[PDB]
RNA sequence: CCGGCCGGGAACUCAAAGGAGACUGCCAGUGAUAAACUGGAGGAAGGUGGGGAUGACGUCAAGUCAUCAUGGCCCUUACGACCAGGGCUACACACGUGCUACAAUGGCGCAUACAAAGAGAAGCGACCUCGCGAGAGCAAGCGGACCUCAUAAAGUGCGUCGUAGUCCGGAUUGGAGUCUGCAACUCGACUCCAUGAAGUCGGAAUCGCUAGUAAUCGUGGAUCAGAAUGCCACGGUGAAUAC
């Protein structure tokens, strides 16, 4: 907005696992307003990732999200002239949501078998740092530190 | 036994008609279950407003058909037949049935 | 068919409901008509806003 | 094999295999398979030849392939020669069932042209 | 003894009858687990009788009508929340912090004139 | 093909069929009724069908069974 | 006959009449001590709670002489009146608003869930019989919380397809049918069999939406003998982001 402060309530924690981040991930991954399909797909991918990596269930995806989160983002700014890519500081929640969106879109663009396996593959290659989410992730880091004096 | 239904458009006029019916029925006899609210019909209409073009200009109207039900199982007939024909029902629709 | 019974169409083809248009009653408009009040959009509203039609009220559900 | 046809529906399920043949749809294929008393999920090619013979005989009972093609084509030229209103639209090329030719009639007229 | 709670959410009226004993949940004269509980309100119906006490402490009989999956889920949750008068209202102090006592007044918004659903305004050409 | 289970024919047009058959083909008969159905009772006959301004003659044949009288009357004019 | 169906009762859902409640009201802090602002408590609902109706003085010689009325002008052996057919449905192109798709968060088969709001007397039309079908015969009940339209679809439980112009996609087209109506050819709707184009996410450019919102899934109503992807209207699932 422009005058009134806003803030959204907190979605319910993810069923059984109780992961608020996982509940937010199903929100982002949701399509056409169908939580059942999103929940089934996320659980299938989560168990596949856990059994493939030999890691636990809760933090197996936490590692990938930690390793695919950025630090600064370029904001199109033009005070006197044309557009300047001015990098800025990323808020905590904004960083988390941006990494989550990156993972979801990276899984979207794949074609391996189906969402259940594509999400697991994205998580694995994000843990390893050889995926496409990470490939897009390093771009902001390389484009940072361009124009500081401007604001 | 004898079930009576009253229809009108106003909510308080039907209430006073039902009050008159029940008061006369209890005076002349007994065994009155009182009026029953039952659903109320909401006939909804919408009409274009401008006499030419201007499709967006519309007006919404609604008619509230209120309905009341009251039944009596009085044994004696000389009370019900006397109750009939003496009541104007506050000038709204009313029906007699068994 | 059964014999020439169908051919008995010598009627002026006016009694058939298809011939009647069911226009308005005060002025007469082919369009903007409703069965309930038997008038047409415009006229209806005039009556409702003037308070002629019983039980008609603005809808604000 | 061609199964009283020309197409070789290999490594494919029964109903789809017979659907791949001209002049036969899903319902007609269901009729053929049920009459032949063959399972539906079993592949046509993986099946034994004793049943392919019965399928040949069963399929030969309906008008299909070039026979049906010529039958339907002959009707077109016939309604063209009759001079019917429904037929003289074919010679020009445009909707004949009564669609609107002003727009959304490009499927039968082909891509646009100035 | 018997204890009653109404429960409502999106024109989804419930009826919850809590009582002592160590029985199971019953919704619509039938088991919730039989009625697809593992995804239908998998952990919505059994919210209120988790935080304050254990599930296997009070028998109950629920029956809800009208609504959908989440409609029934929320209606039963609200009814149970307002059906835990086992000992005074000391538990409502804790349930207030969790926010389960208040219902969800949010409802489907009517369809306006000149719009498609409620706020989908038909697109216009040029400006 | 469609339209119930039986054909329809006009009566003041059905008055001309019997005369035409009894007296043989003499000349096409001018009429307006674009409703009658080519029934076998017409091989070897010519009928003039109205289109609005002029009555176009048309000769009936053997393979016009499911085709109506007004069918062979082009009302759309093109360049 | 273990079906709320039958004795009964009215607690409860619910239905419809009347009331209570929310008013910055009680506290803390900020503020020229005032208005007011921030926060907390209580409370189902905290700050005109959500939504609708409600549209100031005026502008655009904005729209309607065609809804109707009306000043002036004109026709009145025709610019009036009756009828058949035709036309408003044309079609080398362009634009606007929509529907259906390009598929695996899917398609198909079996099973199986959970809703609201409406109409019904030349009308809604159970059940039963015939038909692969649109439908036909019989035809109770219902001027209505009773009967009918009317077994909501998404959803979930199993099996199949395994990434292709395909079991996606349905236009076009041929044959055969159902049904309203004096009348389905110009020019209607629906059904059965067959064929199965384009289309594999879309340039410049541009549109809506901040919470039950958007997104997507069904149902109804008016006009109406027979007609919706349009208009009006009800509900299910249900987000992301506002520095
Ligand atoms: Mg008509
Ligand atoms: Mg006049
Ligand atoms: Mg519009
Ligand atoms: Mg909706
Ligand atoms: Mg407060
Ligand atoms: Mg006001
Ligand atoms: Mg002007
Ligand atoms: Mg003008
Ligand atoms: Mg005429
Ligand atoms: Mg027109
Ligand atoms: Mg048409
Ligand atoms: Mg399909
Ligand atoms: Mg109707
Ligand atoms: Mg009703
Ligand atoms: Mg077909
Ligand atoms: Mg493809
Ligand atoms: Mg109709």
Short mmCIF file of N, CA and C in Angstrom, two decimals, chain F residues 7-63:
data_model
loop_
_atom_site.label_atom_id
_atom_site.label_comp_id
_atom_site.label_asym_id
_atom_site.label_seq_id
_atom_site.Cartn_x
_atom_site.Cartn_y
_atom_site.Cartn_z
N UNK F 7 -42.11 -37.10 -43.60
CA UNK F 7 -41.97 -35.86 -44.37
C UNK F 7 -43.22 -34.99 -44.27
N UNK F 8 -43.05 -33.73 -44.67
CA UNK F 8 -44.13 -32.76 -44.70
C UNK F 8 -44.31 -32.24 -46.12
N UNK F 9 -45.57 -31.99 -46.49
CA UNK F 9 -45.89 -31.52 -47.83
C UNK F 9 -47.02 -30.51 -47.71
N UNK F 10 -46.98 -29.48 -48.55
CA UNK F 10 -47.99 -28.44 -48.55
C UNK F 10 -49.24 -28.92 -49.28
N UNK F 11 -50.39 -28.38 -48.88
CA UNK F 11 -51.66 -28.85 -49.42
C UNK F 11 -52.00 -28.17 -50.74
N UNK F 12 -51.91 -26.83 -50.80
CA UNK F 12 -52.17 -26.15 -52.06
C UNK F 12 -51.10 -26.46 -53.09
N UNK F 13 -49.95 -26.99 -52.67
CA UNK F 13 -48.98 -27.57 -53.59
C UNK F 13 -49.33 -29.02 -53.91
N UNK F 14 -49.86 -29.75 -52.93
CA UNK F 14 -50.30 -31.12 -53.17
C UNK F 14 -51.50 -31.17 -54.10
N UNK F 15 -52.16 -30.04 -54.34
CA UNK F 15 -53.24 -30.00 -55.33
C UNK F 15 -52.69 -30.02 -56.75
N UNK F 16 -51.43 -29.63 -56.94
CA UNK F 16 -50.84 -29.57 -58.27
C UNK F 16 -50.20 -30.88 -58.68
N UNK F 17 -49.77 -31.70 -57.71
CA UNK F 17 -49.09 -32.95 -58.05
C UNK F 17 -50.02 -33.87 -58.84
N UNK F 18 -51.26 -34.05 -58.36
CA UNK F 18 -52.16 -34.98 -59.03
C UNK F 18 -52.51 -34.49 -60.43
N UNK F 19 -52.73 -33.19 -60.59
CA UNK F 19 -53.03 -32.65 -61.91
C UNK F 19 -51.84 -32.82 -62.85
N UNK F 20 -50.64 -32.56 -62.35
CA UNK F 20 -49.44 -32.70 -63.17
C UNK F 20 -49.27 -34.14 -63.63
N UNK F 21 -49.48 -35.10 -62.73
CA UNK F 21 -49.27 -36.50 -63.10
C UNK F 21 -50.35 -36.96 -64.07
N UNK F 22 -51.61 -36.58 -63.83
CA UNK F 22 -52.69 -37.05 -64.69
C UNK F 22 -52.57 -36.47 -66.10
N UNK F 23 -52.24 -35.18 -66.21
CA UNK F 23 -52.15 -34.54 -67.52
C UNK F 23 -50.75 -34.58 -68.12
N UNK F 24 -49.78 -35.19 -67.44
CA UNK F 24 -48.43 -35.24 -67.94
C UNK F 24 -47.72 -33.90 -67.79
N UNK F 25 -46.41 -33.93 -68.00
CA UNK F 25 -45.63 -32.70 -67.92
C UNK F 25 -46.03 -31.75 -69.04
N UNK F 26 -46.63 -30.62 -68.66
CA UNK F 26 -47.04 -29.60 -69.62
C UNK F 26 -46.12 -28.38 -69.56
N UNK F 27 -45.92 -27.81 -68.38
CA UNK F 27 -44.99 -26.71 -68.17
C UNK F 27 -44.68 -26.63 -66.68
N UNK F 28 -43.51 -26.10 -66.31
CA UNK F 28 -43.24 -25.87 -64.89
C UNK F 28 -44.32 -24.99 -64.28
N UNK F 29 -44.73 -25.35 -63.07
CA UNK F 29 -45.82 -24.69 -62.38
C UNK F 29 -45.25 -23.70 -61.38
N UNK F 30 -45.61 -22.43 -61.55
CA UNK F 30 -45.07 -21.37 -60.71
C UNK F 30 -45.73 -21.40 -59.34
N UNK F 31 -44.90 -21.40 -58.29
CA UNK F 31 -45.40 -21.48 -56.92
C UNK F 31 -44.42 -20.79 -55.99
N UNK F 32 -44.90 -20.50 -54.78
CA UNK F 32 -44.09 -19.85 -53.75
C UNK F 32 -43.73 -20.77 -52.60
N UNK F 33 -44.46 -21.87 -52.41
CA UNK F 33 -44.33 -22.68 -51.20
C UNK F 33 -42.99 -23.40 -51.21
N UNK F 34 -42.03 -22.87 -50.46
CA UNK F 34 -40.72 -23.51 -50.31
C UNK F 34 -40.72 -24.51 -49.16
N UNK F 35 -41.73 -25.38 -49.12
CA UNK F 35 -41.90 -26.30 -47.99
C UNK F 35 -42.12 -27.76 -48.39
N UNK F 36 -42.54 -28.07 -49.61
CA UNK F 36 -42.89 -29.43 -49.99
C UNK F 36 -41.63 -30.28 -50.15
N UNK F 37 -41.81 -31.60 -50.19
CA UNK F 37 -40.70 -32.54 -50.16
C UNK F 37 -40.72 -33.38 -51.42
N UNK F 38 -39.55 -33.53 -52.03
CA UNK F 38 -39.49 -34.28 -53.26
C UNK F 38 -39.86 -35.68 -52.90
N UNK F 39 -41.08 -36.07 -53.23
CA UNK F 39 -41.53 -37.42 -52.98
C UNK F 39 -41.52 -38.10 -54.31
N UNK F 40 -41.12 -39.37 -54.35
CA UNK F 40 -41.09 -40.13 -55.60
C UNK F 40 -42.13 -39.70 -56.61
N UNK F 41 -43.31 -39.30 -56.17
CA UNK F 41 -44.39 -38.92 -57.07
C UNK F 41 -44.03 -37.77 -57.98
N UNK F 42 -42.75 -37.49 -58.13
CA UNK F 42 -42.32 -36.36 -58.94
C UNK F 42 -41.25 -36.61 -59.99
N UNK F 43 -40.59 -37.78 -60.03
CA UNK F 43 -39.66 -37.96 -61.13
C UNK F 43 -40.33 -37.45 -62.39
N UNK F 44 -39.54 -36.90 -63.31
CA UNK F 44 -40.08 -36.41 -64.57
C UNK F 44 -41.01 -35.22 -64.44
N UNK F 45 -40.67 -34.26 -63.58
CA UNK F 45 -41.47 -33.06 -63.42
C UNK F 45 -40.55 -31.89 -63.14
N UNK F 46 -40.99 -30.70 -63.53
CA UNK F 46 -40.25 -29.47 -63.32
C UNK F 46 -41.10 -28.51 -62.49
N UNK F 47 -40.46 -27.84 -61.54
CA UNK F 47 -41.15 -26.95 -60.61
C UNK F 47 -40.39 -25.64 -60.53
N UNK F 48 -41.12 -24.53 -60.48
CA UNK F 48 -40.53 -23.21 -60.34
C UNK F 48 -40.64 -22.78 -58.88
N UNK F 49 -39.49 -22.53 -58.26
CA UNK F 49 -39.42 -22.19 -56.84
C UNK F 49 -39.10 -20.71 -56.71
N UNK F 50 -39.83 -20.03 -55.83
CA UNK F 50 -39.64 -18.61 -55.59
C UNK F 50 -38.42 -18.37 -54.71
N UNK F 51 -37.70 -17.29 -55.00
CA UNK F 51 -36.59 -16.85 -54.17
C UNK F 51 -36.76 -15.42 -53.68
N UNK F 52 -37.82 -14.73 -54.09
CA UNK F 52 -38.11 -13.40 -53.60
C UNK F 52 -38.54 -12.43 -54.68
N UNK F 53 -37.63 -12.51 -55.80
CA UNK F 53 -37.94 -11.66 -56.94
C UNK F 53 -38.44 -12.51 -58.12
N UNK F 54 -37.88 -13.54 -58.49
CA UNK F 54 -38.11 -14.36 -59.67
C UNK F 54 -38.22 -15.82 -59.25
N UNK F 55 -39.04 -16.56 -59.99
CA UNK F 55 -39.25 -17.98 -59.74
C UNK F 55 -38.29 -18.77 -60.63
N UNK F 56 -37.28 -19.37 -60.01
CA UNK F 56 -36.28 -20.14 -60.75
C UNK F 56 -36.86 -21.51 -61.06
N UNK F 57 -36.93 -21.91 -62.33
CA UNK F 57 -37.31 -23.30 -62.64
C UNK F 57 -36.22 -24.27 -62.22
N UNK F 58 -36.64 -25.49 -61.90
CA UNK F 58 -35.72 -26.55 -61.55
C UNK F 58 -36.37 -27.88 -61.91
N UNK F 59 -35.58 -28.76 -62.51
CA UNK F 59 -36.05 -30.07 -62.96
C UNK F 59 -35.77 -31.10 -61.87
N UNK F 60 -36.79 -31.88 -61.53
CA UNK F 60 -36.67 -32.88 -60.48
C UNK F 60 -36.07 -34.15 -61.07
N UNK F 61 -35.24 -34.82 -60.27
CA UNK F 61 -34.57 -36.05 -60.68
C UNK F 61 -34.88 -37.16 -59.67
N UNK F 62 -34.20 -38.29 -59.84
CA UNK F 62 -34.48 -39.49 -59.06
C UNK F 62 -33.76 -39.50 -57.71
N UNK F 63 -32.67 -38.74 -57.57
CA UNK F 63 -31.84 -38.79 -56.37
C UNK F 63 -32.00 -37.51 -55.55
#
